[PDB]
Amino acid sequence: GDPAKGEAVFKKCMACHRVGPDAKNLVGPALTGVIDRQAGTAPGFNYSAINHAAGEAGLHWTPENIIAYLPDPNAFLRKFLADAGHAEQAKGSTKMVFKLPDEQERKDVVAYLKQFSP
């Protein structure tokens, strides 16, 4: 992944997300420090039941998980919960109504996000 190109891909995320110092929540949660962060734990953000449940079931945003998540957020979260033994909690839908199908763009945007996490 190329972080330089990733910054350009992030333009597709900026309508709802912010990264950087004192980044604040908007329609979506701040993404500073999201790498390896438990899903649904960004301070002050009101998550969907499914995004919250996935984190409680063990979902952490490793680079691999973000890459697999971006092409279809709902599909990823529902499968994660089912595989974990919490299928009953995968009936809802995530508030993130956006998809990034292209593999390269996904790799690059994740490379960019890694710059803002330990």
Binding positions for ligand HEM, rule: CB under 6 A:
12-13, 15-17, 27-29, 34, 39-40, 42, 47-48, 51, 61, 66, 70, 94-98, 100, 109
Contact criterion met (CB below 8 Å) for 65 and 59: yes
Return the SS3 of 38: strand
CB of 81 to ligand HEM, least distance (A): 13
CB of 24 to ligand HEM, least distance (A): 14
- Comparison of 16 and 84: residue with beta carbon closer to ligand HEM: 16
86 known ligand binder: no
What's the per-residue H, E or C state across 62-96?
CHHHHHHHCCCHHHHHHHHHHHCCCHHHHCCCCCC
52 known ligand binder: no
How distant, in Å, are the alpha carbons of 33, 62, 85, 110, 112 from that of 4? 18, 20, 39, 11, 7
Both tokens assigned to 7:
């910054």
CB of 47 to ligand HEM, least distance (A): 4
Whole-angstrom Cα distance, residue 110 to residue 114?
A: 6
Q: Return the residue nearest ligand HEM (CB atom).
A: 28
CB of 80 to ligand HEM, least distance (A): 12
Known binding residues for heme c are: 13, 16-17, 96
